[PDB]
Structures are given as C-alpha cells and as structure tokens.
Design a protein around this ligand. Structure first.
Ligand SMILES: Nc1ncnc2c1ncn2[C@@H]1O[C@H](COP(=O)(O)OP(=O)(O)OP(=O)(O)O)[C@@H](O)[C@H]1O
Lengths: 594, 58, 79
C-alpha cells in the first residue's frame, strides 16, 4: 500500500492530539471494570469523537469522513486499539466508534432519499414500529487438533464489517484440516455478536400531505440493543449502504431491484419534542416553590390556557396524570392502584379539547384514537413467519400503555368485540392469550381516559340521570368518576367566554413536565392514623346518603378515597399524610355526585 | 495450510488438566472411603444410571 | 433427568451452552444465523393418610369445633 496508507499514518500522528481530552477517558472507564471484576464479592467500548476536535484544525482529513466513509473508519479503529494496550497491558473487542456531533445539512427525512449522498454519513430521525427478533452470529471460531495438541484459527467475514466487500466464505463450519486429526473446536474462545433489524416510519407531522408514511430499516449491534421501545422518537446516524447482487444472480432479471437500502449504524438517542438531568439550581427552586401552600391551585389554573373554569375537572387531570401507587400484596393479589376517570357531555363543550393536549406532555404515553379494531389490547397472532421458522406474538397496544396513559373515544359508537376486551384489562392488569400459539401472561399498568356522548340530545334532566348512555354497567362499576358537563346559559357567563376565545388568535409547560416526573421518584407515605379516622366518618354520612339519594356507591370507592389523597400528598412532596388532603378528596366527590 | 490457519500460542492447554484428572483417583479422603468412588460401585451393578460430579468435591 | 418436568413448574435448570448449525437453505437465506439452545445438567424443582401426619388429624379430634372453627377457617377475609 504506500498511497492508500500514507494519509492513514499522517492521520495516525494527527488524531492523537484529537484525544488529548479522551485518552484519560478511554482508560478511566476500564480500570475500575478491571478492578470490580477482580472483587465482585460492564460497559461497552464507547469512544465518542466529537466534531469539534476534528473540524477546528483538520480539513483534508475532515471531508474524507463526509464524502468517502469507506477508506477511513477501519483506519481509525486499528490506530485506536493500540492505545488500549499501550495504556493497559499489565493486567491479564475492537473498540469501534460512535461519532457524535452536528452534521451540517444531512437531516434527510426518509420520505426523501438522496441522489447526492448515497454511501455517506446520514442523520435520520423518526419512530420505529417493527422491533424484530434477536439472534447471535459468529465472527471467529478457533479449531484445535486434539492429536498433537495444536490449535487453529479461523475468521468468517460477512455483510457486517460495514465497509469492505470482501470475498465471502459460503460456509458454516469446516472439518478435517490438512492432517489426519479429527478437528475439535473450543467454543469458549469462539466469539459471537448479535444482529437485529428494525424499520423506522416517518414522523407524521413534517411529512407534507401527499402520501402515507414511508420506511427504511437499520442494522445495529449489541451496544444499543433493547434500547428501542416501539414508540420512541429516535435519532440514529450511520453509513448508507447497498448490498446484494442485482441482475446476475438469476438470469433474465426483469423488474427486480437488487439493491437493498441498509443502514449499518451506531449511537441512537431518544429525544423529546426520561433523560432530563437538572442542576442544583432548578432542583432547589422547585423545593422553594414547594414551600408555598397554594401551588396545588396554581398548577390547576396554569394547565389549559384556553378554557374557562372546570377546576374540578382541571385538578382531576393533574391528579390522574401524576398517578397513584399500587402496593403489591406479598403472596396475594394486588389491588387496583390504577386510576381511571371518565367524562360525558352535550356536544361542543370542550370534552375533546383537553384530551389531545395531554398527549403533548405525555412523558412517553402514546395513545390511540379509539378506533376499535381487535388489537386494542391484544396481538392477533401476527408473526409474518419471521424469516422461515420463527413465530412472534407481536405487541399490539399494551407495550406502549405501560406506566403511561391512553385515551379512546366513542364508546357507544362501537361494536361488542372491543367491550369484552376492556372488561379484562380493567379487572386485571394483564392480558393472557393463546391464539394459535403460546399462552403468555404479559404485564401492563394502564389508565384509560374516556370520552362518550349522550344519546338523545339534551334529555339528561327530564329523565333518570342514570342509564343515560346505557352501555353495560360492567364498566361503570369499574369506573369511579362520571363528570356530567353542564352547558347552562348565563349572560355574564357567555360574555366572558366570547372575549377569551377572541383574545387568543394571535406556570410554564416544560417546568410542569419536570415537576411531575420528579414527583414519580419520591417516596410514598400511606401512613397516618389521623387522616384515616376522619375519612371513614366522611364516608359513613354519605353511606347514609348514597342509598336514599342519587347513586349507590360500593367498597371500591373507598379505595379511591385513599388513592386521591395519596396522590394529593404526592403533590405536596412529603412523607406525612396530612389532614388537609382529606378535605379536597371529600369535596371533589361531592361535586362529582351532587 | 497458509492464511492464518495457525493461532497464537495460548497458555491454557489441556494436558495440564489431563493429568489433574489423573489425580482425581483415590486421593479425596475428607469426603466411607473414596466417596465418589463409592458411587461408582452402585452403577456397575446396574440399578441407577446418573453420577453426580459436583463442584463441592472440587 | 427425563420425565421430571411439568407444564406449570416454577423451576430453574442449570446447564451448559452451545449453538447449533441449521444445515438447510444456507446460501440464499440462513447466512450466519445461529438459533442456539442450552443443554441441561441439573433440575432443582421448587414449590411442590396414617403416614406421619396423624398428629394433626388428632388436633381436630381433640379440639373438636367442627361447625364454627372450620367455618372461620376457610375464607376468614370477609365481613
Ligand atoms: N366550554 C368551552 N369553553 C371554552 N371554549 C370552548 C368550550 N367548548 C368548546 N370551546 C372551543 O371550541 C373549540 C372546539 O371544541 P371541541 O371541538 O373540542 O368540542 P368537543 O369537546 O370536541 O365536543 P364533541 O366531542 O362533542 O365534538 C375549541 O377551540 C375551544 O376553544
């Protein structure tokens, strides 16, 4: 080699200053991993090269990485790995790259493919909805002649080295090397690696309205597997790559593409438009405003900046969204610790308004639109044969609902077959199915939010308040709060409405999402004899007043009456169940029932 | 054969373990005589076909 | 170790690991996929009439109390 190797070596003296700040980093990450492994009685080989250390002072070496990314990366690895041993060889796995930074206009939205940069560096974002299997793969197996005691060596190359199209080895395992010895193979010293494909859709808001979402796929490696839950705003970066013989491997080859698009990439990141690290400053201010004894009320009014009133509804949403705990019974069935509120109202009274903006601040809680095909909580045994001999129970809609919220619409405008499914997932946290395959109890922590409409217009007052939708009481008994939104007409009421819609055709949100997601990590009190003494008195008088009046209540309603106040103390961020929480819990039900 | 058929010399061989199983003869006298040899007699007379070579005896 | 497992056994197996070749349609498909299994070595199963149990049959005979203590015995978790 002298021409193709010279600017390697000139870079081999160049980039060693481009890890003046990382040559500490790459050895500090292993010296304790070498230490703890010797005193057990763990991290991969990630070497994040920024742009900044390779753009401030190298230009010929720079643009080679963004024009021809095929003669440069295995140079960068081979010159990396000697520094692993030249730093660390006394105690007795190739350290590939990641390359974070910016890029300067390669945010190819994959609705667009490129004519300029094929076989180059690409930055891609979107959502994944495939999540295929996991399967290991060999790279190097070592053979051993059991007679004469001598060893052997063999490496298999594939379409996995990411860059060099070597002569493949169309072989699985050889036998009988040039001797009369029956070949033995040591599998502890044979190395493996995994292999997982995933398809990425289009972020369906920035693709303009002329098409359905498109998709491509990406092969990643072990370092960031099981990181990709289906429904994450992911952002990957890798090389663009074609493989496969198009036009010769079969004869006459008419109308068959033979150039599959692939991405053999690295370093995914979740984004947000779970990881939000805050400093000492904002963590102290949120304690400083915690000292105020009004902030439960301020958060109610600072949520929906368009609509008047409904402060009973507005406190309920933030009470539900933050969530109440479920303490599992030891060697016993745990109870309902989910909360599940419901609404109904005569039309155009903002029943669906506030239902869509809970999805923006959802904190990884992606909901459906309530279109009630069978698949709302199940699998329907969709396997697609998974490359000839693998059957997979593909996750329909509960792998996204776990420790999150959902919302569905149009209950009475549904068939029967969804209603039997919402029976099971409410009485029990899990679904278990055996369609043409395997019985499997997979767990789910869900919390529905409902929206239906009454049937006969404005007939609520002149008839019974109950049966007003007459969907089965299997769900009404499994639900707690049936807010009936009024629309009464008062000349000061509507006049106040008329300007407030008009004033908006022309205490903050990201602080709000931090406060709740910090409050999911604080301890749960549950324990004060004072607060439990007053609520049962508060129950008994309405236990005299439920049956001689509107609506009979049951024992599970008491498990609400702990749970609302339990979450209400989670707003307080304290470990003492106070007295003041028990007054808002009683008063909220009093409007919900009267 | 050429092209990287031989490997590096590994210090971990098998002949050093082969003779170390030869000193798994009658020598373990802590645990009525050689106890793992006592189980060897209750198989040859054909009533049970599963020896148990644990890590406790190692 | 055969005939010693059951559907519904909350158990654990200890055993040794190896992958296996596929030897079918290995060129077009089946490039270097592996589809391994594990090989078993040991099973440590868990959570399983006048034969050293008669002492507790006497505890009902000596104490008596059929109509009420046994009534409080099954399902004492209600009102
Ligand atoms: N009670 C209300 N107060 C203030 N604005 C309202 C109210 N109801 C509706 N609006 C205005 O009307 C617009 C749309 O209301 P929306 O379509 O959500 O009614 P809805 O809840 O969907 O009723 P339905 O589900 O029966 O159609 C919103 O932009 C909102 O500003």
């Amino acid at each position: 080699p002298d021409a193709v190797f010279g600017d390697r070596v000139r870079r081999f003296q160049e980039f060693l200053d481009t890890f003046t700040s990382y040559r500490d980093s790459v050895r500090s990450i292993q010296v304790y991993n070498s230490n703890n492994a010797a005193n057990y009685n763990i991290l991969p080989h990630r070497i994040i090269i920024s742009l900044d250390d390779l753009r401030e002072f190298d230009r010929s070496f720079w643009s080679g990485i963004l024009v021809e990314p095929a003669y440069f990366i295995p140079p960068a690895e081979k010159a990396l790995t000697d520094l692993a041993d030249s730093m660390d060889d006394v105690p007795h796995h190739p350290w590939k790259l990641s390359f974070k930074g910016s890029f300067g206009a390669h945010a190819l939205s994959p609705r667009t493919l490129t004519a300029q940069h094929l076989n180059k560096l690409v930055s891609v974002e979107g959502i994944v909805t495939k999540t295929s299997l996991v399967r290991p793969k060999l790279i190097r197996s070592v053979h051993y002649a059991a007679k004469t005691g001598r060893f052997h060596y063999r490496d298999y190359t594939d379409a996995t080295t990411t860059l060099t199209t070597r002569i493949p080895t169309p072989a699985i395992y050889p036998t009988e090397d040039t001797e009369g010895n029956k070949l033995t193979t040591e599998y502890g010293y044979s190395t493996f690696i995994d292999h997982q494909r995933i398809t990425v859709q289009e972020m369906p808001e920035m693709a303009p309205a002329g098409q359905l979402p498109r998709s491509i796929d990406v092969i990643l490696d072990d370092d960031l597997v099981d990181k990709t839950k289906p429904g994450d705003r992911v952002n990957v970066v890798g090389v663009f790559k074609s493989l496969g013989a198009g036009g010769m491997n079969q004869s006459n080859s008419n109308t068959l593409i033979g150039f599959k698009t692939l991405i053999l990439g690295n370093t995914v990141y979740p984004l947000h438009a779970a990881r939000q690290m805050l400093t000492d400053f904002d963590i102290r201010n949120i304690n400083k405003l915690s000292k105020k004894k009004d902030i439960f009320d301020i958060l109610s009014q600072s949520l929906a900046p368009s609509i008047y009133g409904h402060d009973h509804i507005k406190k309920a949403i933030l009470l539900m969204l933050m969530g109440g705990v479920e303490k599992n019974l030891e060697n016993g069935s745990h109870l309902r610790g989910d909360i599940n509120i419901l609404m109904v109202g005569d039309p155009s009274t903002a029943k669906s308004q506030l239902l869509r903006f809970v999805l923006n601040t959802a904190s990884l809680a992606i909901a459906t639109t309530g279109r009630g095909s069978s698949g709302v909580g199940l699998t329907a045994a969709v396997t697609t044969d998974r490359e000839t001999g693998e059957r997979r129970l593909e996750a329909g809609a509960m792998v996204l609902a776990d420790r999150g919220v959902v919302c569905i619409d149009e209950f009475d405008k549904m068939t029967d077959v969804d209603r039997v499914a919402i029976h099971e997932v409410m009485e029990q946290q899990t679904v278990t199915i055996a369609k043409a395959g395997i019985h499997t109890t997979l767990n789910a922590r869900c919390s529905v939010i409902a929206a239906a409409n009454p049937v006969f217009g404005q007939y609520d007052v002149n008839r019974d308040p109950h049966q007003n939708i007459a969907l089965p009481d299997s769900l009404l008994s499994r639900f707690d709060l049936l807010f009936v939104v009024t629309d009464d007409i008062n000349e000061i009421r509507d006049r106040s409405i008329s300007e407030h819609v008009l004033r908006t055709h022309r205490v903050t949100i990201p602080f709000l999402r931090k406060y709740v997601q910090y409050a999911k990590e604080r301890v749960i009190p549950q324990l004060t004899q004072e607060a439990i003494n007053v609520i049962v008195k508060n129950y008994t008088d309405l236990r005299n007043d439920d049956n001689t009046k509107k609506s009979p209540i049951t024992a599970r309603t008491l498990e609400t009456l702990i749970r609302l106040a339990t979450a209400h103390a989670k707003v307080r961020l304290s470990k003492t169940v106070n007295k003041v929480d028990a007054k808002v819990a009683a008063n909220l039900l009093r409007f919900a029932l009267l | 054969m050429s092209a990287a058929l031989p490997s590096i010399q590994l210090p971990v061989d098998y002949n050093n373990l082969f003779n170390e199983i030869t000193d798994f003869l009658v020598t373990f006298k802590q645990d009525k005589g050689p106890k793992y040899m006592a189980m060897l007699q209750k198989v040859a007379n054909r009533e049970l076909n599963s020896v148990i070579i644990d890590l406790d005896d190692i | 170790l055969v005939r010693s497992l059951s559907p519904g056994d909350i158990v654990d197996v200890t055993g040794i690991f190896l992958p296996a070749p596929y030897t079918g349609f290995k060129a077009l498909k089946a490039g270097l996929l592996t589809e391994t299994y594990l090989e078993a070595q040991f099973v440590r199963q868990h959570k399983k009439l006048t034969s050293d149990v008669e002492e507790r049959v006497m505890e009902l005979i000596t104490s008596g109390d059929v109509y009420n203590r046994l009534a409080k015995s099954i399902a004492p978790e209600i009102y």
